[PDB]
Each structure stands twice: as structure tokens, then as C-alpha cells.
Design a protein around this motif. Sequence first.
Motif, mmCIF file in Angstrom:
data_model
loop_
_atom_site.group_PDB
_atom_site.id
_atom_site.type_symbol
_atom_site.label_atom_id
_atom_site.label_comp_id
_atom_site.label_asym_id
_atom_site.label_seq_id
_atom_site.Cartn_x
_atom_site.Cartn_y
_atom_site.Cartn_z
ATOM 1 N N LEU A 70 0.675 -1.433 0.064
ATOM 2 C CA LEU A 70 0.096 0.003 -0.037
ATOM 3 C C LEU A 70 0.996 1.130 0.067
ATOM 4 C CD1 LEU A 70 -2.796 1.278 0.489
ATOM 5 C CD2 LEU A 70 -2.342 1.239 2.854
ATOM 6 N N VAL A 71 0.957 1.957 -1.252
ATOM 7 C CA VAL A 71 1.627 3.128 -1.101
ATOM 8 C C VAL A 71 1.316 4.292 -2.021
ATOM 9 C CG1 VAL A 71 4.084 1.919 -1.176
ATOM 10 C CG2 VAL A 71 2.697 1.820 -3.401
ATOM 11 N N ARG A 72 1.757 5.301 -1.831
ATOM 12 C CA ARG A 72 1.229 6.577 -2.475
ATOM 13 C C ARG A 72 2.270 6.739 -3.583
ATOM 14 N NH1 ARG A 72 1.724 8.768 3.487
ATOM 15 N NH2 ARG A 72 3.235 7.299 2.946
ATOM 16 N N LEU A 101 -1.509 -1.162 -3.985
ATOM 17 C CA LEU A 101 -2.966 -0.539 -3.751
ATOM 18 C C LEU A 101 -2.748 0.847 -3.432
ATOM 19 C CD1 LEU A 101 -4.759 -3.504 -1.691
ATOM 20 C CD2 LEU A 101 -4.661 -3.070 -4.060
ATOM 21 N N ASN A 102 -3.715 1.729 -3.641
ATOM 22 C CA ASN A 102 -3.471 3.170 -3.119
ATOM 23 C C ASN A 102 -4.976 3.553 -2.986
ATOM 24 O OD1 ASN A 102 -2.941 6.035 -3.210
ATOM 25 N ND2 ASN A 102 -1.657 5.892 -5.097
ATOM 26 N N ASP A 103 -5.068 4.712 -2.258
ATOM 27 C CA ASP A 103 -6.498 5.242 -2.129
ATOM 28 C C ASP A 103 -6.683 6.398 -3.304
ATOM 29 O OD1 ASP A 103 -4.273 6.649 -0.659
ATOM 30 O OD2 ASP A 103 -5.979 8.353 -0.267
ATOM 31 N N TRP A 134 -12.169 3.098 2.098
ATOM 32 C CA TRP A 134 -11.048 4.117 2.649
ATOM 33 C C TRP A 134 -11.318 4.983 3.772
ATOM 34 C CZ3 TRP A 134 -5.936 3.346 2.880
ATOM 35 C CH2 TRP A 134 -5.035 4.358 3.319
ATOM 36 N N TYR A 159 1.046 11.147 14.351
ATOM 37 C CA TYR A 159 0.122 11.256 13.303
ATOM 38 C C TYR A 159 -1.306 11.207 13.872
ATOM 39 C CZ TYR A 159 3.643 8.142 10.975
ATOM 40 O OH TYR A 159 4.829 7.812 10.417
ATOM 41 N N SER A 164 -5.338 10.664 6.990
ATOM 42 C CA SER A 164 -5.074 9.511 6.149
ATOM 43 C C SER A 164 -4.489 8.261 6.868
ATOM 44 C CB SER A 164 -4.082 9.862 5.003
ATOM 45 O OG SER A 164 -2.999 10.469 5.692
ATOM 46 N N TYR A 165 -3.888 8.432 8.041
ATOM 47 C CA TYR A 165 -2.993 7.546 8.791
ATOM 48 C C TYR A 165 -4.031 6.687 9.631
ATOM 49 C CZ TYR A 165 0.542 5.195 11.490
ATOM 50 O OH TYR A 165 1.507 4.307 11.931
ATOM 51 N N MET A 168 -5.451 4.468 6.960
ATOM 52 C CA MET A 168 -4.541 3.500 6.645
ATOM 53 C C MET A 168 -4.490 2.261 7.753
ATOM 54 S SD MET A 168 -1.630 1.959 7.588
ATOM 55 C CE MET A 168 -0.575 3.408 8.515
ATOM 56 N N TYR A 172 -5.604 -1.356 6.695
ATOM 57 C CA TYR A 172 -4.796 -2.611 6.925
ATOM 58 C C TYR A 172 -5.401 -3.457 7.925
ATOM 59 C CZ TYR A 172 -0.691 -2.936 4.093
ATOM 60 O OH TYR A 172 0.140 -3.056 2.802
ATOM 61 N N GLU A 192 6.899 -2.645 2.883
ATOM 62 C CA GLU A 192 6.572 -1.065 2.834
ATOM 63 C C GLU A 192 7.898 -0.378 2.335
ATOM 64 O OE1 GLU A 192 5.681 0.733 6.715
ATOM 65 O OE2 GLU A 192 3.805 -0.734 7.026
ATOM 66 N N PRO A 193 7.677 0.966 1.999
ATOM 67 C CA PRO A 193 8.734 1.991 1.387
ATOM 68 C C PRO A 193 9.881 1.954 2.390
ATOM 69 C CG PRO A 193 6.736 2.877 1.006
ATOM 70 C CD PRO A 193 6.592 1.697 2.159
ATOM 71 N N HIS A 341 13.359 -1.585 9.491
ATOM 72 C CA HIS A 341 12.386 -0.515 9.444
ATOM 73 C C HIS A 341 12.801 0.581 10.238
ATOM 74 C CE1 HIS A 341 8.924 2.145 9.541
ATOM 75 N NE2 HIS A 341 8.511 1.327 8.387
#
Length: 394
Positions: A70-72, A101-103, A134, A159, A164-165, A168, A172, A192-193, A341
Amino acid sequence: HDAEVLDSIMDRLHEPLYEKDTFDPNEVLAENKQLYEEFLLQEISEPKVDNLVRSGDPLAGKAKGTILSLVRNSDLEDIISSIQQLEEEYNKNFGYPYTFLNDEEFTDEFKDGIKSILPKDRVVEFGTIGPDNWNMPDSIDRERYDQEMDKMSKENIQYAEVESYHNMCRFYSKEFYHHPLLSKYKYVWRLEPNVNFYCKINYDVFQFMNKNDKIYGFVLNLYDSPQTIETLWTSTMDFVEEHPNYLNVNGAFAWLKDNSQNPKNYDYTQGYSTCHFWTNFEIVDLDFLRSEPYEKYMQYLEEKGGFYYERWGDAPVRSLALALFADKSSIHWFRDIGYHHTPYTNCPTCPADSDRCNGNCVPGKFTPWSDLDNQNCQATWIRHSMSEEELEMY
Ligand SMILES: Nc1nc2c(ncn2[C@@H]2O[C@H](COP(=O)(O)OP(=O)(O)O)[C@@H](O)[C@H]2O)c(=O)[nH]1
Ligand SMILES: [Mn+2]
């Protein structure tokens, strides 16, 4: 459930694992670090099972699994970095597909960027998440949300005011596995990134899970910030009182109730250690998430609204469900998956003449900042959740 068995589970879920004043958290921390170290400094290589599926074996690549992110659009460079490391240490030899996947809709430049860094035969799919799957739902009072998250930001909760957090965490927790692109898979590897992999993995991980009846794989196990989850445990106990039959008699109950290292966490939540699998990495059997106990629990939490009135993370939510509703011997610690991470690292130890790990991590060093050593819950999991068959798996 036999009524004696159930009463015994309920008693454990309602008392601290250690009685007040029979422990000093500093000594506990020291002994927990030593136990952790004994594991992380043990020479390991691969799971000690006879059924491993090697690259080019007939079963290699054949699990119904995907690497999921899930990423932007804006995460393109950081997700590439993660993908390149996962390919180099694992996937170049097994070729599982990627699902993104993305919103918002992925741009063509995102897609092209991803494809440019993967082999031509690697399957990639891109999906958008429907806004109803979402966004903050109508059940939430946005003005209460604002006021709660104001209070929470004064406490400096990361956050808290980022809508958005919240979305998310909820996605998830309870929605990702319902996305249409995922309907055809049994397993996901969450990516994750901006993460790192350090060690070569020379068996099919999804097939290992399937062949050894594991529903969940993790690398790192942490305490959470109790102020994000003020009422998650008390609500989850109300749900469990209403559905005792969802309890697994071999659940990870001690791990949920360990008050000895961070007693203030346990007091703040009124009964939860706050230990959780650190879900930025997770290998998950989606049949568990799709099962009645998990889905009912998710519905219950949706009704409480704590994804928005508090800051409930996907990690504690997933972890409570796994610990309460599944047999703890089905939850695998992937000691061999060297992984980082920020700010934590799982960095195992190899035999002296092995080149399995690349040397970019220091073995056993969980974090460079020793103040965060008390955020490690892995000693609790080793002590209470692993039986002989897990302890001897590496
Ligand atoms: N598409 C999309 N991805 C998100 C959004 N917010 C977070 N993520 C992703 O969700 C995952 C968790 O978020 P991250 O920002 O990494 O949070 P942390 O690891 O909890 O600090 C990562 O894969 C992020 O790229 C969002 O608003 N939209
Ligand atoms: Mn992240």
C-alpha cells in the motif's frame, strides 16, 4: 469449550502475568536483553524442517501469494528501494507477483517506474481502493474526532491529527484482504517503503508457511504507545466475553498480559502489555483474516470507532486477534529474515563460513538507541509463546 478450560483462560486474561511488586522493571529489562541476545547471537541458517521448497523445484513459485504494498505515488523511490532488496535477497529466485494498492489512482509514471526496475516476466498489478473502503465512515462524528485528536496531539502522539493515517490503520486492519485484486490469493507478504533486507532466503516462504501450518510470520515484536490505544483492550475483552467460543485454548495469553518490563503500559490500558507484531513486515495467511472470529472482531471495533476517536494501529489489532483466536504455535518468528525498518532491526548470526547475510547489519543489534531497548517484546514471546518445536526450528 469445557467450562473449566474457559474459566482458566478468562482468569488469565483478567490478571497481570506478574504480581505487583515481585519484580523490578530494570532487572526484567536486563534479563530480557540477555535472553534476546542469546537468540540473536546463535548461529542459524534456515528452518530445520525437511520439506523446504528450493528455487526451481516443482512447487517453487506455486503458492497463491503476492507481495503487497500500500503506497502513494510519492513513495515511488522508497518502494523501489524496498523492492530491489526483496528481489536480491529472495524474490529473484521465486518470482511471486507484486500487488500495489492506493487510495488514489496510480499514475502511469509510477507504474512505468516500478516496471523499469523489475524483470520483464515479473507480474505487477495496480489497484485503487474505492472511497467507501478507505474514507472515514458516516458512523464517526467528525467534530469529536477533531477534539480527541487535538487532545492527543498535546500528548505528542505521532500522526494523531493525520486523517489518512487513521484510514490506513483501519484499511490494513480490516479491509485490504477484501480488495478485488487480492481475492485470488491465500498469502501476502507485506512490503513498505524504505526497508532493508540483509540475508538470502533460499526456500519458498509461502510454501514453508503452508507446509508447516503457519498462519502468520513476523520478524520484530514491540510494545506500543499506550495513549494510542486507551480502550482497545477493554473493548476487546467485552468482545471476548460475548464470544468465548472464538478463543483458542493455545492462544498467546501470557504475551498479552506481561506487565513486568513496561508496567505503566499495562496499567494505562487496564490489562494489555501492548506487545504486538510489528506489521510493516508480515507474511499472512488471509484465510485467518477472512475467518469468522477475525471478521466479527473487526466489525466490533468498527462500531466502537476507536480507529478515529483513538489512534488504533493495525499492528495491535492484528496482534490481539492472532493471540486470542489462534494457536500460538501457528505464528512463526522468521529469525532468518534479516530486516530493518527505522528504528529497529532483526539481524541474525550466520556460521563462520557463510555468506548468507550481506554484512550491512550488526548481529543482534535491535536498535542504535539504547533508550528504545525497552520497546522490544521479543523476550516475552521467546519465554512464553514458543514451545520446543518453535525454539528448535532454527
Ligand atoms: N496509498 C496510501 N498509502 C499510505 C497512506 N498512508 C500510509 N500509507 C502506506 O501505509 C504503510 C504504512 O504507513 P507509514 O507511513 O509507512 O507508517 P509507519 O510505518 O506506521 O510510520 C506504508 O506502506 C505507507 O506507504 C495513504 O494515505 N495512502
Ligand atoms: Mn513505514
